[PDB]
Structure formats: structure tokens, C-alpha cells
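[recover] target loaded
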């Protein structure tokens, strides 16, 4: 009676990201896939090729001038760039200071990763999967007109728009490092999406940024300090999601599993193990409610691949051996060659009392949902 799990993967995505002549250059989705197969997880899920997204899909959320710019970005146009190209790279926040899809096939990279998310939504809509996974997605911080990180299109908004065609109520949860402001804002004035964001304290997503009009109280924010550990996160996550499920009764869940919240990420300050990150998914998966699982940020490639391999196993109801079976990227897991990671020595600035404080605030906010003028 296992859950039906559909796993979306474009095998050419590494080719779009690094070019056809770098087949062994480590690419986060290609390596994640490698680890998943090394644990025989293909035996427990359906592997699906996504339908590619196109510009018309992107333009539901994104500005035409931005999407046209992305179409123009090629190795020939951005190498020795004309000043007009450099100015656009700045205006649209496209970083060209690393090898990556900018220098290979940016637009098809976008079509493939976003297509995975929108294809996952369509499959959940047709009830052909109970859980749909797209690790290449989860780009929640991409703006209508600006890129961010690994992301150039906001596949999360696009996926949620797709789900709203068939589902009355969507619960979106995110455990990546930054606030997915762009997702929260896309849905801020509706009660047909509840957003719950666990993120580093920053410029957006304060604990009283809880929604507008029909959306009042349907945006939840947990702005957390440096050094978040498994214990702290669990103490907040489980009670808040327990109450959200009881009160909001979503028809479908989207979980963004951004891996920049892991210990030792060079662009995050949190201290989660893979067990502590995965515990969030384990709790969500315990509900027999349709589920989309997405990736996101995460800048220590071996830790990202371990994290999403482990979470694939959680999705399919398998336990994995911590001793890594042979894979095609073994040197990157030296010297211990384990699936799980240890937290660093980083102090947790989120005190026990800070966690109780935020918990009581969010639980109180959810109580106010019961008094909303109308029900979705």
C-alpha cells in the first residue's frame, strides 16, 4: 500500500549546465541522481522525464523584458560582453562570475528545471502520483525580473499556479536558508495558499508579515538566527505544522527542501544535519495528502546530494545505510564516505526561549485563521 512516487529528472540537465563535453564535472542534480541510483531507489519510484516549460509559462509570473534577456544569454554574448550586456546582467541580477548554465544552455536549463516542477504539479493534478519530486526545482527567491543563485525562473510560483487549477487549498512550506519572499508575495492576498517559511532573519519575512485582506494570517514566518540546529528546528517545525494541518486542511502540500540550511554551507549560517533537515520531510510525509518535493539552494555539493538522496529515501519509505555504496563521485565524500554529516561547532543563537517565543506567536496566529471572515 506504498505511496506512488513520481520522480522528475532531465538527464540532459548537466549538459545544459556545464556543456556536453564536461560529463564528469560535478553538477548538483546529476550527482544527487547518481547517489539515488547507488541506493537502488529507482526500484521504488517511477522516473519521469518532465515536459519542458517555455517562455509563455515563465511570463505568467516574470516580465517579458527579463525572459527575453534570458533567451539572449549565451557564452558568445556574455564573454567579453558589450557594456550594454554588462548593464543588463546587473539590472537582471545575472551573475557571470562562475562556470554555469550562462556559458552553456541557460534557457534550456530553465525549461528543464521549471518544467520538472510544473510537470510535477500537473501529475498531482491528474492524481497519477501521491508524491512528485523535482530536485532541480525550488528556486523560490527568483524575482519577476531578477535571478538568484542557481535560479533564473521562479518554478515554485509556476508550480503552485498549476496546482491551483485543481486544488482548493495549497500548503507551501520552505526550509531553505533565505526567505522565499517572491513565493509569499505571489500568494499574499489569497487564502487558497498558506505559506510557512523557516528562514534566516533578514529584510523580508518578519514574524508579523502575516498577510493582507483575504490573505490575512495565511502567511507564516519563522525568522531564525544564526546556528539553527536540529533540536531547535524540530521544536518549532512539528507543533506549527501540526496546527497548520489541523486548521488549514490543505488538499496538497509543497515542501521546498533548500539545502543551504545545512551545516557548513558557505552561504548559510545554520547548522542542521541531514537527519534534522529530513525530519521535516518525514513529518510532512506522515500525512496522506498529495505532496510535491522540491530542491533549492545549497552550495556544498556533496552535502546537497547526500541530503536529497536521503530525502528521496524518506519519500519512498526506505531506510538507507550510512556507509556510502560505490558511486561515480566518490572522492567528493572523502575521507569518511558516509551519507550523514555532523553539525559544526557553530553556536546556536536561537535559544530554547527564542524557540518557545516564536512557537507561541505562530500557534496564536493559526488560531486567528479560525475567525477569518470567510472559509476557502
Amino acid at each position: 500500500g506504498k505511496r506512488r512516487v513520481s520522480y522528475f529528472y532531465e538527464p540532459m540537465i548537466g549538459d545544459y549546465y556545464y556543456g556536453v563535453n564536461q560529463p564528469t564535472k560535478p553538477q548538483r542534480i546529476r550527482v544527487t541522481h547518481n547517489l539515488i541510483l547507488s541506493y537502488n531507489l529507482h526500484r521504488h519510484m517511477e522516473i519521469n522525464h518532465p515536459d519542458l516549460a517555455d517562455a509563455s509559462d515563465f511570463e505568467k509570473f516574470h516580465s517579458l523584458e527579463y525572459i527575453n534577456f534570458l533567451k539572449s544569454v549565451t557564452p558568445e554574448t556574455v564573454t567579453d560582453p558589450h557594456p550594454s550586456v554588462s548593464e543588463n546582467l546587473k539590472r537582471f541580477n545575472v551573475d557571470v562570475d562562475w562556470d554555469g548554465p550562462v556559458f552553456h544552455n541557460l534557457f534550456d536549463y530553465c525549461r528543464a528545471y521549471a518544467g520538472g516542477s510544473i510537470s510535477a504539479a500537473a501529475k498531482l493534478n491528474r492524481q497519477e502520483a501521491d508524491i512528485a519530486i523535482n530536485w532541480a526545482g525550488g528556486m523560490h527567491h527568483v524575482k519577476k525580473d531578477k535571478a538568484s543563485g542557481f535560479g533564473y525562473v521562479n518554478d515554485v510560483v509556476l508550480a503552485i499556479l498549476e496546482l491551483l487549477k485543481s486544488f482548493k487549498r495549497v500548503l507551501y512550506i520552505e526550509i531553505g536558508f533565505p526567505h522565499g519572499d517572491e513565493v509569499e508575495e505571489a500568494f499574499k492576498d489569497t487564502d487558497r495558499v498558506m505559506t510557512v517559511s523557516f528562514h534566516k532573519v533578514g529584510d523580508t519575512g518578519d514574524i508579523s508579515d502575516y498577510g493582507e485582506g483575504k490573505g490575512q494570517y495565511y502567511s507564516l514566518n519563522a525568522p531564525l538566527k544564526d546556528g539553527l540546529d536540529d533540536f531547535s528546528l524540530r521544536g518549532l517545525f512539528i507543533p506549527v505544522i501540526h496546527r497548520a494541518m489541523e486548521i488549514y486542511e490543505p488538499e496538497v502540500i509543497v515542501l521546498q527542501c533548500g539545502a543551504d540550511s545545512l551545516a557548513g554551507d558557505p552561504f548559510g549560517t545554520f547548522n542542521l544535519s541531514i537527519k534534522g533537515h529530513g525530519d521535516c520531510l518525514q513529518y510532512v510525509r506522515s500525512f496522506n495528502v498529495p505532496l510535491m518535493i522540491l530542491g533549492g539552494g545549497g552550495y556544498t555539493l556533496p552535502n546537497v546530494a547526500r541530503c536529497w538522496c536521503y530525502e528521496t529515501a524518506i519519500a519512498v519509505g526506505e531506510q538507507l545505510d550510512n556507509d556510502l555504496p560505490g558511486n561515480d563521485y566518490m572522492k567528493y565524500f572523502r575521507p569518511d564516505y558516509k551519507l550523514h554529516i555532523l553539525p559544526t561547532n557553530r553556536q546556536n543563537l536561537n535559544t530554547r526561549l527564542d524557540i518557545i517565543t516564536m512557537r507561541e506567536t505562530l500557534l496564536a496566529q493559526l488560531s486567528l485563521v479560525m475567525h477569518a471572515p470567510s472559509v476557502p
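[recover] notes: The beta strands are 5-8, 46-48, 131-134, 170-174, 193-200, 219-224, 252-256, 291-294.
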